[PDB]
Amino acid sequence: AFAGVLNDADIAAALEACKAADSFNHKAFFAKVGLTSKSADDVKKAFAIIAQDKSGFIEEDELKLFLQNFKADARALTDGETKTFLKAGDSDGDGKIGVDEWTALVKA
């Protein structure tokens, strides 16, 4: 779903690095996959994908499936990984990650 925004090479290496359960770190994934250097238009396309439906937010259960947006058969994040990722992104603490949070998080 990221064809045209992120290259396959980086996506391959990013998934590879966080292979073992609990090895995931969103900041490392962002950097390796090439997200932090993308335009505002691509960063919003990325949000629309990860957020799945049209609730306008990345709900926790959606976050858990973060890696699958890149590779269909990727593993789901662990409860631990999901919580760490959510905690760092959910600035307003409403339990989910909205667009502003996403934009900001990608800039941190």
Ligand SMILES: [Ca+2]
């Ligand atoms: Ca959603």
Ligand SMILES: [Ca+2]
């Ligand atoms: Ca939030």
